Amino acid sequence: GWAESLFGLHMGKVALITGGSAGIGGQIGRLLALSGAHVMLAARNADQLEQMRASIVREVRDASYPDAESRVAIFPGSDVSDIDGLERLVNHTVRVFGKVDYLINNAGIAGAEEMVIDMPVDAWRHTLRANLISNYALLRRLAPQMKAAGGAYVLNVSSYFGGEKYVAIPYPNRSDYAVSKAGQRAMVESLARFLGPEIQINAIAPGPVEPGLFMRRARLILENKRLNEVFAALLAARHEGATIADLLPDLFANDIQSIANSAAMPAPLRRLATMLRETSDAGGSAQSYLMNATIARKLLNRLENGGYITLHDRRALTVEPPEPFFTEAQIEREAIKVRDGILGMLHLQRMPTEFDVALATVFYLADRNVTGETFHPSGGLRFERTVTEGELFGKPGQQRLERLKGSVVYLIGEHLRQHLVLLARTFLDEIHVARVVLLTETTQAATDLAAELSDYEAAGRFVVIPTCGDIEGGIDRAMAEYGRPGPVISTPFRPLPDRALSARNGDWSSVLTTAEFEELVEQQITHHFRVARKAGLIEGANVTLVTPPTSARSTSEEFALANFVKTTLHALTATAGAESERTVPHVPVNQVDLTRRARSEEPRTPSEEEEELQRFVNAVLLTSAPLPTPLESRYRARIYRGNAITV
Ligand SMILES: NC(=O)c1ccc[n+]([C@@H]2O[C@H](COP(=O)([O-])OP(=O)(O)OC[C@H]3O[C@@H](n4cnc5c(N)ncnc54)[C@H](OP(=O)(O)O)[C@@H]3O)[C@@H](O)[C@H]2O)c1
Numbered sequence: 001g002w003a004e005s006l007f008g009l010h011m012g013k014v015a016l017i018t019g020g021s022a023g024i025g026g027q028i029g030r031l032l033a034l035s036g037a038h039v040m041l042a043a044r045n046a047d048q049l050e051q052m053r054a055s056i057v058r059e060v061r062d063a064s065y066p067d068a069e070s071r072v073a074i075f076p077g078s079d080v081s082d083i084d085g086l087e088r089l090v091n092h093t094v095r096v097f098g099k100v101d102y103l104i105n106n107a108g109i110a111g112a113e114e115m116v117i118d119m120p121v122d123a124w125r126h127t128l129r130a131n132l133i134s135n136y137a138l139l140r141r142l143a144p145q146m147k148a149a150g151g152a153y154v155l156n157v158s159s160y161f162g163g164e165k166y167v168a169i170p171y172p173n174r175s176d177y178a179v180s181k182a183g184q185r186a187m188v189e190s191l192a193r194f195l196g197p198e199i200q201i202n203a204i205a206p207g208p209v210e211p212g213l214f215m216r217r218a219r220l221i222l223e224n225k226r227l228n229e230v231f232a233a234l235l236a237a238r239h240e241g242a243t244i245a246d247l248l249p250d251l252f253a254n255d256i257q258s259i260a261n262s263a264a265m266p267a268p269l270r271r272l273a274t275m276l277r278e279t280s281d282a283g284g285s286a287q288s289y290l291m292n293a294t295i296a297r298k299l300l301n302r303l304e305n306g307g308y309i310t311l312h313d314r315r316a317l318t319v320e321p322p323e324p325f326f327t328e329a330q331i332e333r334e335a336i337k338v339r340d341g342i343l344g345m346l347h348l349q350r351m352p353t354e355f356d357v358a359l360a361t362v363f364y365l366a367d368r369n370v371t372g373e374t375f376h377p378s379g380g381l382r383f384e385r386t387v388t389e390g391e392l393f394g395k396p397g398q399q400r401l402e403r404l405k406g407s408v409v410y411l412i413g414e415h416l417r418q419h420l421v422l423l424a425r426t427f428l429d430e431i432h433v434a435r436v437v438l439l440t441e442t443t444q445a446a447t448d449l450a451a452e453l454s455d456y457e458a459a460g461r462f463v464v465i466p467t468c469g470d471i472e473g474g475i476d477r478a479m480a481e482y483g484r485p486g487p488v489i490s491t492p493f494r495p496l497p498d499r500a501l502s503a504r505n506g507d508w509s510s511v512l513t514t515a516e517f518e519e520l521v522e523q524q525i526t527h528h529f530r531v532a533r534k535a536g537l538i539e540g541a542n543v544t545l546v547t548p549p550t551s552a553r554s555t556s557e558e559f560a561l562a563n564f565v566k567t568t569l570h571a572l573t574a575t576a577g578a579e580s581e582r583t584v585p586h587v588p589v590n591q592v593d594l595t596r597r598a599r600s601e602e603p604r605t606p607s608e609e610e611e612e613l614q615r616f617v618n619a620v621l622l623t624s625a626p627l628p629t630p631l632e633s634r635y636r637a638r639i640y641r642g643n644a645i646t647v
Helices: 002-006 023-034 046-062 085-097 121-149 175-195 213-239 244-251 256-261 267-279 293-305 328-344 354-364 398-402 417-429 443-452 454-458 471-481 514-535 556-582 606-624 634-639
Strands: 014-018 038-042 072-075 102-105 152-157 199-204 408-412 435-440 462-466 487-490 542-547 589-593 644-646
Touching: 002 023, 014 023, 014 085, 014 121, 023 038, 023 046, 023 102, 023 354, 038 046, 038 085, 046 072, 072 085, 085 121, 102 121, 121 152, 121 175, 121 199, 121 514, 152 175, 175 199, 175 514, 175 556, 199 354, 213 244, 213 267, 213 293, 213 328, 244 256, 256 267, 408 417, 408 471, 417 435, 417 443, 417 606, 435 443, 435 471, 443 454, 443 462, 454 462, 462 471, 471 514, 487 514, 487 606, 514 542, 514 556, 542 556, 542 606, 556 589, 556 644, 589 606, 606 644
Parallel strands: 014 038, 014 102, 038 072, 102 152, 152 199, 408 435, 408 487, 435 462, 487 542, 542 589, 589 644
Antiparallel strands: none
16 A cells, blocks of 8 residues: 555655656656645656646545646656756746745666767767756756755756765766766765755665667667777787778778788788678678678777878778668677676666655655765665775886886866976976877967976977867877877866855855856866767877866865766766776776865865875876786776776
């Protein structure tokens, strides 16, 4: 009798639920209605919203709630990636019910389902708006009335793949999804003290809930596998002297037996084509044609963005292969492996239903003494890999640093002048690099830093390049003339916002706006994703992403935003790291944080700030010097990627 136990549990609350016409959000909306709450459901398709509303209202009357027809409302055409539309959703909800007590940030899309090195930047941005920026947007508009009335709750529906406190969990090929789920948890952790005690804010993070989905995902896996084998062989041939752009006409002949027996093909490509013709299912054209159209366009994108070829070297496929490319048998073999992976994660060997998760969640929502937590209503999972955030302990080995002699360094930054200059001086004077290229945002910063190091600049050992925000272009320019990188160190162009996070009394003009939160995600998360996207394609690069310090004022709000940035970015660094471990060119990714775990640990004297800068140098070095590949150490290649090191 679960309905009987729900009765009156949330009597008189008004809940807004996004993505509320099916799945978990439909069940939470259903069970909140069955607990006496007025619910507004929001999704895109209006008829589904109508059918779910019908079903719920019927149950509400059977439960003997008064005037059941007026207890459920719908609001169609609500795409949570459309941040400006959420305002009309809220306006309508306050208009219909008078107030919002519960905000259930439930809607969540799957994202791009590509590796970091393949992800279109605007697909990344779209996932983050839908899964992450939507949640602050709704919270920020509702928080004033919620603070006023005081019985209020924000619930972000996150995931185990958004990690846990101080721990990131890599989700290969899903970095956008993982970053938005981590960011939902991070928002809960970072805001709870400012929104309390009137607003509780928590996340839930269910485990897995119950052509099919494993079929689409299996197909992507087979396509990715083929694309990686070709990219790898292309690099191994370019390694032996081949010019990649000149192999493209013959390669895009697409015939596997042609490529395998061409003397005009470098040996790597021939060994790959031989294996393919011998292993791939013969009932598919994949055994006779190298690539389909998707593989081809992505292969060219990896080569153009990695700087291996130019726009003029782009070729269409001579012959688009005939379906079926991958046979149904291959796709099923791989989908069963996907499914078994997921199922084997689970300690209980069974999955919850959407109703189960909803039920536990709706009970959880009745507890009034918990905030800033991540509740698992479904749970019990063993993960392939977890990465704890940590603190720098030790120094890099001399041998590894010597391997940096003569390399080219790319620095990306703007406002952290002292850090950038110290990095450059260290790389040139003590590491003996060939040269340091600095990519700034504004021209002025380029000129000032070129001045403070005018000596190295005259000698050609320091270069500056103002990007005016065009990160991809600067890396292409630098690669074109100033040398191909080893160490790449991305720092943020912009500082953290100096904004409040909660009201002083009933004044909210000073609290971080939705647009400002959007800018924060752009400049402290997407900025580094753009760097990692390009540099992950560069054979022989190392990537380090640096999260910003606080200002001298060092306000609690600023500290909260820094920890938000650190937690959210780590999901990217860990997923990029796990991807590197599996796919050539195995470019490592690691993260360095300039804000400490606890606020009392921040430097308070100039001597302590000197200790920090020294440590910062040592961590950037520890992650910049050549790291072990999977071939040298299977263990060390795993653990020396995906870290977040506080200094
Ligand atoms: N294995 C799991 O299912 C699992 C586990 C952990 C976490 N989660 C999280 O749980 C949440 C819901 O998962 P689910 O499996 O129930 O999702 P789902 O199957 O995609 O649920 C679909 C619901 O969301 C709506 N929706 C879809 N795209 C939308 C968009 N762009 N804007 C607004 N509404 C949209 C749909 O209506 P329309 O399509 O008509 O708009 C419908 O109401 C997500 O945040 C997800 O990350 C799920």
